[PDB]
């Protein structure tokens, strides 16, 4: 049989890849780091509390001005908040209540959201007529949407429940690039700061580094045991962090092509729903479902803080572009800004 | 505050008022989750109730507003979106009786009932169970035995004793029988008792939720 020979060709290619990235491993990140000073104890207080949602919220995204944020929940509302004064700038009603993702455009003119209706809806905020209306319906993706992220005001990459990612152009509505290669359905997505490439994490226990302009997978990252729910880039764009259902977060390189460090402790048995980095990338914040967020020293794998202000599952979190604050939202219908 | 911040706070107060007004009328409606295997009579159930990822059907019955979610057409990993339906009032689970000896289809129906009925998110949720095709079930009992599905079965096969065996074989699947209540109904393509059975099972959950609202749990 020729297909057994082709599967063995795939097996010796995997053995060559595994030995090639075993060859580069001369030191861990722990042995490079641990001479330097620890972060200490991070004590972050609930500076604001945004309370207008009435169901479980599933996503959040900060603005680029670090004052505006968007929040999406399961009562069919995404609310745009002023974070400084806790004023509700906008409240956009949804066509479908089942929404698992939201994004805020870097210009600030649009939001996007999506969920179990297979569609990334895109809404125009800076309208001449005063209200927020639907700018685009992005359909054709045959599985629940997991993540939407704007590149520009015309380009958005989406993650779906049908093992595919998709680069769209907004003004035509057409899926201009399809990113295939996952075998379990893909749950998280994160854009590079120079927006040339992105990373996506799936139920394969694998993350894949894609390429927006060319259109196909550059590197594959393996090492988790269960479904990985969260992914985020380091601010240099040379590393990224995953968080899964293993009670583990992990760090991976793009240039060294290996596992860097596992952020895990024995007391956590439950999953990770969200990750994001600080502005310097020194501390990684992970949202959990033992109801509280953890602040990890990303270089030394210590626990630096616990953000414990929620009494349901922390579903989403995010750090400002200033680095000034952290918003964590949760299944108990409350956003908290911490500082 | 400034003269412009005061109108911002007044905008936020009107937005708070609209959010309370919508979220207090989304709490007086009944959310139902349709489940079942492919070709298990769910389309006929939507037909009898009402007269590309999720299908939402709206109907009213005895001054009660029902929103019913068919999620069966979305074919992916169920464990990554089933916690979205925590807080659904009742689960309408549809099993076709006449798909017993087909390819064995009852064992995937029982596997789906064992997966749904013992989920951590639906630990308290009542499960209405519609056994869907009895008129073809009697015509297939009169030509074929029930021992294709169940080698351990030993009973008379006329109309009423095999169907009770299917009902108790589905009812035995939960490890917990006291936390949730399973409501089993026998239906055809032509009967008008189905939505009344739905309303009668919903009214018990409404009574328990009203007692939880008034502090009794």
């Amino acid at each position, epitope marked *: 049989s020729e297909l057994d020979q082709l599967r063995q060709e795939a097996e010796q290619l995997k053995n060559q890849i595994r030995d090639a990235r075993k060859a580069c491993a001369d030191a861990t990140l722990s042995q490079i780091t641990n001479n330097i000073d620890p972060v200490g104890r991070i004590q972050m207080r609930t500076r604001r509390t945004l309370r207008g949602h009435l169901a479980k919220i599933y996503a959040m995204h900060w603005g680029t001005d670090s004052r505006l944020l968007v929040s999406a929940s399961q009562d069919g509302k995404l609310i745009i908040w002023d974070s400084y004064t806790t004023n509700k700038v906008h409240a956009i009603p949804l066509r479908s209540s089942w929404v698992m993702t939201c994004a805020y455009a870097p210009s600030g003119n649009y939001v996007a959201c999506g969920g179990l209706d297979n569609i990334c809806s895109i809404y125009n905020l800076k309208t001449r007529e005063g209200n927020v209306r639907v700018s685009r319906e992005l359909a054709g993706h045959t599985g629940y949407l997991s993540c939407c992220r704007f590149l520009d005001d015309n380009q958005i990459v989406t993650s779906s429940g049908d093992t595919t990612c998709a680069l769209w152009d907004i003004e035509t509505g057409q899926q201009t690039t399809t990113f295939t290669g996952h075998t379990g359905d893909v749950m998280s997505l994160s854009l590079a700061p120079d927006t040339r490439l992105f990373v996506s994490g799936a139920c394969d226990a694998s993350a894949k580094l894609w390429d927006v302009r060319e259109g196909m997978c550059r590197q594959t990252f393996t090492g988790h045991e269960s479904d990985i729910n969260a992914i985020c880039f380091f601010p240099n764009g040379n590393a990224f962090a995953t968080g899964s259902d293993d009670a583990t977060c992990r760090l991976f390189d793009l240039r060294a092509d290996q596992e860097l460090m596992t952020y895990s402790h024995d007391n956590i048995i439950c999953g990770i729903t969200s990750v994001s980095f600080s502005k310097s990338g020194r501390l990684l914040l992970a949202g959990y479902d033992d109801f509280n967020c953890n602040v990890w020293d990303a270089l030394k794998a210590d626990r630096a803080g616990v953000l414990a202000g929620h009494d349901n599952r922390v579903s989403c979190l995010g750090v400002t572009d200033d680095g000034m604050a952290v918003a964590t939202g949760s299944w108990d219908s409350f956003l908290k800004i911490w500082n | 505050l400034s003269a412009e911040d005061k109108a911002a706070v007044e*905008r936020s107060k009107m937005i708070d008022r609209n959010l309370r007004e919508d979220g207090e009328k989304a709490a007086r409606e009944v959310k139902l989750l349709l489940l079942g295997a492919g070709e298990s009579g769910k389309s006929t159930i939507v037909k009898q109730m009402k007269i590309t990822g999720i299908v939402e059907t709206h109907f009213t019955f005895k001054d009660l507003h029902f929103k019913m979610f068919d999620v069966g057409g979305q074919r992916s990993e169920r464990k990554k979106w089933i916690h979205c339906f925590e807080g659904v009032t009742a689960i309408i689970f549809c099993v076709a009786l006449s798909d017993y000896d087909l390819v064995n289809r009852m064992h995937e129906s029982m596997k789906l009932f064992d997966s749904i009925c013992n989920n951590k998110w639906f630990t308290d949720t009542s499960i209405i169970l519609f056994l869907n095709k009895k008129d073809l079930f009697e015509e297939k009992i009169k030509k074929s035995p029930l021992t294709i599905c169940y080698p351990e079965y030993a009973g008379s096969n006329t109309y009423e004793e095999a169907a009770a065996y299917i009902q108790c074989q589905f009812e035995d699947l939960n490890k917990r029988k006291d936390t949730k209540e399973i409501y089993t109904h026998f239906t055809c393509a032509t009967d008008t008792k189905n939505v009344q059975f739905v309303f009668d099972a919903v009214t018990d959950v409404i009574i328990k939720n009203n007692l939880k609202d008034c502090g009794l749990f």
Partner: single-chain antibody
Amino acid sequence: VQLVESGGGLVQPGGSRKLSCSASGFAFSSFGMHWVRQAPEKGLEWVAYISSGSGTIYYADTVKGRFTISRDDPKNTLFLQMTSLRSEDTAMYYCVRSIYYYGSSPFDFWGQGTTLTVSDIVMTQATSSVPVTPGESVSISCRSSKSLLHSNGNTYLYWFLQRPGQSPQLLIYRMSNLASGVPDRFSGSGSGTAFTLTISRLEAEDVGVYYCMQHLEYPLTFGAGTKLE
């Protein structure tokens, strides 16, 4: 966006009139509304303000007690009711759309106005009229009595422009921020109480009277006017 006013005509002293303004093309139920006077030779003066959903109503001190504002959210019309019409009310009135959230542009869309002839912080326009050679940079200054810089960071100074025979429009809201539909010729700078509009590379449809208004506290007070020739 379309705001058209009605209720014109001459009137006796001591008379009454209900001016109206029909709105269409925008979400009128979420806009705060204003009325703003212009005398036939003097500049602009603010009349009255109704908020979104009728919860906050302000008047000017020269109109407090006599005038009455009323909005109709389903039918999309805004009324101003007169009683005891003095000889200081022989003017042309403009209905002003505005909206207030973070980053919004209030005072951006103005009506065509209507005529009716009856038969604080002070603003100083630093030059009454400037002769203009086209293509050159033009600086127009304005002065307040109080500091307009609030403690949040905003500077409530609103630079407008009224072309001859035309309605006013917003050029630079909140002392520095360019309005939508206005080119990068126009700019606004300033400091504590001293303000400077800049018109670099001036072209046609730029002649007309310029106004500086403030929104730090009520009443809203305009400048005298600065005509370019």
